[PDB]
Amino acid sequence: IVGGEPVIERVNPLKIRIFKSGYSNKVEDADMIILEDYWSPGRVIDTYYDVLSPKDIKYIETMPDYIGERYGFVNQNMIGDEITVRDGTYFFDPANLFTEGIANSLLPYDLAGNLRVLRLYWKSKRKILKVKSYDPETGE
Amino acid sequence: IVGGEPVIERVNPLKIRIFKSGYSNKVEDADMIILEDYWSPGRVIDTYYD
Amino acid sequence: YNTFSLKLLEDALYELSASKLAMDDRLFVIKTGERGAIQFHKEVLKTVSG
Amino acid sequence: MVISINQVRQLYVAKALKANTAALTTAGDIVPKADTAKTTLYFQSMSPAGIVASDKINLKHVLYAKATPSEALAHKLVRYSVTLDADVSATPVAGQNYILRLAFRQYIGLSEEDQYFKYGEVIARSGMTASDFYKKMAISLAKNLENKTESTPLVNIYLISAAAASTDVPVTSATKESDLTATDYNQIIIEETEQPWVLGMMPQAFIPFTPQFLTITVDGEDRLWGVATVVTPTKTVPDGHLIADLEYFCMGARGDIYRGMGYPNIIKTTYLVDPGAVYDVLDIHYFYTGSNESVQKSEKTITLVAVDDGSHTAMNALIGAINTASGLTIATL
Amino acid sequence: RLNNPSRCHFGIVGSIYNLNDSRPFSLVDMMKPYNYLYDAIHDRLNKAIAS
Amino acid sequence: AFGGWLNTQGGDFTNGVTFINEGGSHEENPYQGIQIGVDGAPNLVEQGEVVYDDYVFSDRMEIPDDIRKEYKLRGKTFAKAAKSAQRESEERPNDPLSTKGLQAAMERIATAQEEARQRKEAHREG
Amino acid sequence: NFPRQMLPFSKKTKQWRKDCLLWANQKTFFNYSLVRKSVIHKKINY
Amino acid sequence: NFPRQMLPFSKKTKQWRKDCLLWANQKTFFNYSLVRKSVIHKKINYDLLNGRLHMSDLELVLIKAAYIPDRLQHYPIMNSKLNVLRGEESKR
Amino acid sequence: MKTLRTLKISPNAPDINSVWLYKGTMKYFNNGEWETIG
Amino acid sequence: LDTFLNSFPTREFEDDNEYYWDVIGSSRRNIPLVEARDENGVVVAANAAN
Amino acid sequence: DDPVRNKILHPMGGVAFSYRYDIWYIGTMDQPNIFKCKIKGDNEYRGYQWGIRNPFTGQKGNPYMSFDEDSAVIHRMATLGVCVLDPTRTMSLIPAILQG
Amino acid sequence: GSAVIHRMATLGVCVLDPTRTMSLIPAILQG
């Protein structure tokens, strides 16, 4: 539900992190989905006109200018320290590592004028009560 | 709307600067759009006489 | 101090306020006596005459 | 205090030398042990509760072993010679307020933005010479910077007579005008002082300062009054407190990581270094590599402290016990 | 729009024919390497015809 | 307008409670209330009362200690107790368990207000 | 610099609206979209 | 450390909800999922369909300049295989 | 660099920031005292 | 120092290792004289006639 | 006015870098004079070099070990620059005690 | 690399009052 109406969007499979599922083919079975994207400032006011403090508008309104798939690269389980980059992609050990870095994450909080909107959906635990009550009229 | 009546033209994809789009494949999703063309002096008064 | 001059007081209170305070936070309300109010009067009378 | 380590550091106090594992009788002795095949070096030190050995240094995997005297671990207390600029005026002028600002830069924090500004001022009069000025300003600073109300010792200020020119006559807030009796004063020396020290809770640190002068009108143009040159230091703070705070840190690698946290329940580790004695320091920095594909090295270092009697007798005899036993050339200091 | 006071755009409406948030690979771009190879081999053909 | 509403995601979601603020007291407001409806016809309310299913929880009364340990109320007033029964249901207007948890809890404070109004009425006429 | 858009309707005067155009002047040289190719690449295609 | 989700609703406060978001920003970009592949592996498969050939994905590299005597021209013959199946789905 | 706007004829020193005129002297305040010209 | 560097705009570069920008002057110029000669090929000195 | 980075004091009170005058914007240029340069969109590194566990990301278990130590090493690398197209649109005025 | 499976675990056993445990050990298992 965005802007009062239901919307539907396809999610970029390079921009969705599906955590804590059980060899399930279904994405609905996951416990924790993080969606990163680069939204325009106009799209965040279309969606969050209703919850963004006047202080938070001045965060959008104090942005330097514009810039505009190299968001930024992470490498976990690095075997070594020797990284090679001057054109903008990171080159590694030949067989120990990836050997090259094609963007693996959306690290910078603003690219172009576009802001960065990280959405986290997660299943937490809620304590409830199960109550056994008898029907007044019959014994149910 | 020009001349009181609605029109529709095509935008030359070399003559438009689409700012602040959010990895959208659309053009209405832009926060700022600059149209730079060269107009005849008749077309600048067919549009802005008033 | 041995002898009160405002060159000592305006530089005790500018070096303190420049190092520790913001711009609009430099209001100093000085508590003194009756003989100190006239002593504060006589030094700035020597300053404003300058 | 808390120091940085290259992945570990462990300290052993070398109070006495025994050269054999059977003579380790009292607390704090050291024996640098090694076998005839020059491949393994370790130090068997008699702790206050039994014989404790060191990490076995593999002598093909040492990196550097250099021993430092105690005159290189003394922070020299800097001086500042406050004088009248004689190009401005040879004698003090009879009307202006002569005010000197001391700009302290690390007063209660660590950052240069925790500042402190202390002052002294003389109203100079007719016939007041320079020696009567320096007599009248060193009292005007000692009432401020060496008073009995102040939280911390800030500076130690002095006066120098031109006939003596080497010894200082110290001025305190209680010093009267008749105590300083000399007509040949020529400078005012402001010296850094030793701040307090607590074992482990408050490290040894110093509060720096710069004497800065206020403008006076000479002729019709407001000029600066003084000049402040850095005189070479004469007083040095000893090595007693930097090594007690180093041992108190490095006993926690071989021992309890908490030191006194929760006091019905602490383990009193007895400390052997005296904070009233000067110490020499020797560091053997080595590593570990296994005979496998795990060729990354794990750096380690061992600090040996020993008492200095002025001629470095205990440390040069300790180095000679390591060089003949292990076959390294640790340079005698 | 009826529920958003904030959903507005300009008269300009259009679309990019791309794949998964990329810059678009057009039909001309996917045939341009083959048209550059045609001109070089129709060059060697024309200099064999001439000589 | 943040009173008993979840104005998020472009829509206006409520949990049934009508937080009534910013009008004035019955003496201070010139229209002797806010006059939310024409049902009696002058249904008058003030800056403190809350409504759930046309039932007004009064802000001028207090909570008796007898009717606090019974019914397990948390607020010092019946309005400030119905402002504390919906604190779970404020962020979740469409939860089926929270709508059942609210309506079951709103009948208790509705019961406890009628018990305290009866005790105040019986004592003053005696 | 593009002037402040977080203003009331009264402070959006004639000189403010003239500032947005004079900012936009000479901005047609560059490229500003993450999902468009360059004008020097499409003029090769035409 | 993810904060404890076994709490009553009164202890899910303003700072607890903020601490869940500062965890997702900071820690997780993990991409360790059992049934789905890695983001650099999918991006190569997308880049092959925009006609970009990564030379580090068909050999060990021993370039980065956009010229053929040390790079390799790409010939997009996988696009027309896939554009039938996205064309049939549109006509179903 | 020190303006002196007024001139006062008086047998006693009028002010720091004026110029003292006696019969055949002109004394003005500089160097903490009164120096005469000529 | 951070809020100083936030008032400056941004520009995405296509990698590479260095950037050049081209600066331009004016097309109009005055040219100095070497020497003038009269009709018979000899130069005009300073102490000469018209 | 910063006394942490600017360490030379001036004889007229306060630090000597604060006595420096600089006119950063002179007239209208029709472009940014001073802007921040940045490669392919901000590009940054967030490497990780960890053994049997990772305290940084909170992970026990490593199927592909970096080393065998009980550690975690973070590496971060970024490339960045600033540009002044017209330095004649900027005029400086510096105290000479800062030595050129 | 070498293919090494590493495993690690922490533990500890607390005996609160060792006065409530009695043992008779044969003399050949001492010293």
Swiss-Prot record, chain C:
Q: Where in the cell is it found?
A: Virion
Which superkingdom heads the taxonomic lineage of this protein's source?
Viruses
Relate the protein's function as given in its record.
Capsid protein self-assembles to form an icosahedral capsid, with a T=9 symmetry, about 77 nm in diameter. Each asymmetric capsid nonamer is covered by 9 capsid auxiliary protein, 1 copy of the trimeric head fiber protein and 2 copies of the dimeric head fiber protein.
Misc remark:
Displays an HK-97-like fold with an insertion domain that protrudes at the capsid surface.
Assembly and oligomerization:
Interacts with the auxiliary capsid protein (via FD region). Interacts with the head fiber dimeric protein. Interacts with the head fiber trimeric protein. Interacts with the portal vertex auxiliary protein.
Name listed for the protein in its UniProt record? Major capsid protein
From Swiss-Prot, chain D:
Q: Where in the cell is it found?
A: Virion
Record carries keyword tRNA-binding = no
Q: What's an example GO cellular component term for this entry?
A: viral capsid, decoration
Top-level lineage group:
Viruses
Mostly located where? virion
Q: Which UniProt keywords apply?
A: Capsid decoration protein, Capsid protein, Virion
Spell out the residue ranges making up region: FD. 75-237
Q: What information about domains appears in the record's comments?
A: The central region FD is structurally similar to Helicobacter pylori flagellar cap protein FliD.
| Biological role | Auxiliary capsid protein that forms an outer layer on the major capsid protein protrusions.
- Subunit structure comment from the entry: Interacts (via FD region) with the major capsid protein.
The protein's name in its UniProt record: Auxiliary capsid protein
Swiss-Prot record, chain G:
* Top-level taxon of origin: Viruses
Instruction: Kindly list the places in or outside the cell where this protein is found, as annotated in its UniProt entry.
Output: Virion
Q: What does this protein do?
A: Forms the portal vertex of the capsid. Probably involved in head assembly, genome packaging, tail attachment, and genome ejection.
Q: How does it assemble?
A: Homododecamer. Interacts with the Cargo protein 1. Interacts with the major capsid protein.
Q: Which named protein is this?
A: Portal protein
Native species of this protein?
Bacteroides phage crAss001
From Swiss-Prot, chain I:
Compartment(s): Virion
| General function of this protein | Forms short fibers at the surface of the viral capsid.
Q: How does it assemble?
A: Homotrimer. Interacts with the major capsid protein.
Output this protein's name: Head fiber trimeric protein
